[PDB]
Amino acid sequence: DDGLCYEGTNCGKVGKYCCSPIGKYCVCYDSKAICNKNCT
Numbered sequence: 001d002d003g004l005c006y007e008g009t010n011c012g013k014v015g016k017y018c019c020s021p022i023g024k025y026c027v028c029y030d031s032k033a034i035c036n037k038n039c040t
Contacts, residue, residue: 001040002021003019003035003036003039004019004021004040005017005018005019005020005023005032005035005036005039006018006019006020007032010026011026011027011028012025012028013019013028015030016028016029016030016031016032016035017029017032017035019036020027021034025039027039
C-alpha cells in the first residue's frame with residue numbers, strides 16, 4: 001500500500017503515467033490507476 005504516482009514523461013510514459021517513490025522503480029502503465037494499483 002506504500003507508494004505514490006506522478007504524471008509527465010520521465011519514464012517515456014508519454015500519454016500514460018509512472019510510479020516511483022524515489023525514481024528507482026520508474027514503472028509506468030496506461031491506467032493512472034494501474035500506476036497506484038499495479039505498481040505495488
